[PDB]
């Protein structure tokens with residue numbers, strides 16, 4: 001028992017972290033096989049940042065200008081290319097620590113662990129969610145660009161995120177491992193509108209099930225609701241509309257606990273309308289939305 | 305910017321995790337040099353659990369009865385001994401993945417990362433605090449015993465905790481790496497009183513500084529207080545009494561932000577007396593106490 005915002009063990013990813021320098025800029029790179037991936041803004045200087053001409057800047061760079069260091073050793077760069085907003089530096093040595101891996105594009109509302117790095121060195125690991133508006137509320141300082149987000153299924157690391165930018169609002173933006181930004185963001189030092197965010201309803205429901213499994217039951221009530229009635233409340237409180245697909249994914253939790261998904265929806269409805277009344281659920285005084293139904297099952301059963 | 309409940313990267317600890325079996329029981333062990341450490345209750349059966357005679361049970365066990373597996377390989381046990389509530393199994397092979405390490409006894413109120421494991425395999429990593437009453441509110445299921453708590457200073461892992469038990473209340477109890485329980489707990493399946501817990505005041509203050517550094521400022525006010533006046537409020541709200549030693553440790557944060565520690569104490573006093581008024585601080589709707597002043601400085605500066 002007990003429920004925590006658990007991150008995946010970061011070992012397999014730590015062995016992939018390298019430092020990438022180009023001119024004055026140093027950031028993090030991801031070394032997999034004989035390729036190092038990093039944000040393309042490593043080639044910029046402060047004068048470029050407002051609106052960099054990435055193709056033009058990269059043309060002034062040669063393989064020898066990209067300094068790649070895996071802690072103690074220097075990697076020899078034999079090729080460079082820009083794919084979307086990432087640079088792929090072909091090195092002459094395959095990373096001996098390369099785990100089984102996949103590059104995946106996650107959906108908004110899904111969760112992942114971030115291994116925050118500085119100068120190719122890991123400082124910490126935290127679990128977070130891709131917001132419905134494609135931003136992440138992370139912890140990133142200058143130098144952390146290139147730090148990656150990932151999930152682990154047994155021994156295979158699915159890399160889903162690479163950090164690129166902090167918006168003027170202090171929220172974070174990044175790309176998949178093919179360099180495509182999540183959301184409407186561009187890698188420029190400009191004010192950029194992030195979409196209207198919403199709370200990930202399916203995740204809040206999954207977390208309410210985790211609470212029941214672990215003893216916090218005070219919020220359970222004598223009521224039920226419908227998808228339509230619940231979605232009217234979710235609309236008012238800026239929550240993601242719940243669909244039968246979300247009800248379906250909550251099936252194992254509904255089955256384990258015997259609490260019908262719509263009955264849990266009714267508990268959520270009363271919590272949205274009345275608040276917590278100074279009480280807590282799993283150590284939180286708000287409705288947590290960074291645990292997917294998959295995260296709840298995995299943690300509640302001991303999946304390694 | 306951004307502030308997260310960050311855990312240390314778990315790589316160095318993952319390479320130390322092994323599986324220990326004795327009879328029907330399987331739990332986790334920590335392999336450092338040529339020694340495997342694990343909770344001594346691995347030698348019990350359900351009939352023993354109410355009040356095991358550990359010395360008597362261990363006498364019925366030989367080196368060959370302790371099955372130690374480091375994932376793929378079986379370790380040869382050449383010695384066994386019980387030190388307090390831990391068993392130390394001498395193996396014929398030193399762990400090639402042994403990092404620089406220390407065994408430390410942490411103080412209540414200090415924080416650390418837990419690498420939750422099952423059958424010698426890591427499932428996740430989370431940051432937590434040793435409560436003033438020596439319990440930890442973790443996430444541990446059956447089989448997680450032997451999972452360890454630790455801190456990392458550059459390349460040296462300081463192991464501070466080994467998980468042993470879940471109290472009837474669902475709170476967790478464990479030992480240092482010499483097998484000494486934190487708190488008054490004994491490794492028996494009995495109801496055991498945990499002391500009256502309190503909120504770690506110095507940590508809440510450190511977290512209020514992290515909030516200011518990262519933009520959340522609404523709670524700052526036109527007031528100041530004294531240690532005596534503040535401690536009267538802390539007494540009423542079951543918070544740890546603040547001392548000049550705590551004020552001293554908050555020095556770097558007071559210096560960085562220009563907010564005198566007693567002025568921050570006055571903001572905390574008003575938050576205790578009035579609540580959050582439906583607002584949040586760093587994504588939380590309560591006063592967070594799992595970040596030490598050291599954690600705040602490390603995270604706010606990018607220490608790897």
Ligand SMILES: Cc1ccncc1NC(=O)C[C@@]12CCC[C@@H]1C2
Nearest residue numbers: 041140141142165166187188189
């Ligand atoms: C300073 C910082 C802190 C945390 N996370 C990211 C950053 N860096 C940036 O945002 C750099 C830029 C803006 C210009 C193009 C390139 C993305």
Ligand SMILES: Cc1ccncc1NC(=O)C[C@@]12CCC[C@@H]1C2
Nearest residue numbers: 345444445446469470491492493
């Ligand atoms: C079942 C479980 C779940 C999570 N954390 C720990 C446990 N296990 C125990 O508490 C076992 C005992 C009680 C008897 C002696 C030995 C400590």
